[PDB]
Amino acid sequence: QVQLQESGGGLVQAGGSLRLSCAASGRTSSLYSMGWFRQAPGKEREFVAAISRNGANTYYTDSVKGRFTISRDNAKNTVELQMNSLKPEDTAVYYCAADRFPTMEVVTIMTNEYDYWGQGTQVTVSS
Amino acid sequence: SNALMIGRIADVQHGFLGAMTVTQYVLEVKEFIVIRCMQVKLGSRVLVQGTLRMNRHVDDVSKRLHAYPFIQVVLGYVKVVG
């Protein structure tokens, strides 16, 4: 019914940058808030960044503020995450998620409220 | 514009807009309406009191003005009457 496809990850050095992209297909008419989440190997999945359906409201976890930028294009059904000034601490598997909650401008800031999850893309930062 | 409505909570959102955190619920009255706030959980039968807002926003693709109506609570209340 809904498939999420992450791309753009991989390996980089400290201070470097990547741009993660997430394409959504299927019944995208039921998708609203889109968000990026990450899981360091062995720990809980954690909120990184999220954006509302209209793209007017965005939210970021404190430790990526000023380094990460989330955006979206509704004509292409894609959400993007520009990652700059990367640190070893950012090493994790990144997932794009979608929320079913029918709202235009409000961004969902709670992880367990997201309904759809992609397979994930590995991001490794080394020094 | 005042709304007094009875329904069941079908979805819950801990959200954020305009630098302010909000909690929203989907009220399945079957039609539905969103209740915005500035003991209520998934499955609750509730009675809601608040201002009906049309809350019109311009669609990105179609470029059309659409309503995205919600019942605002601040006067207002949300009473679990299950």
TrEMBL record, chain B:
Superkingdom of origin: Eukaryota
Protein name (database record): RNA-editing complex protein MP81
Species name: Trypanosoma brucei
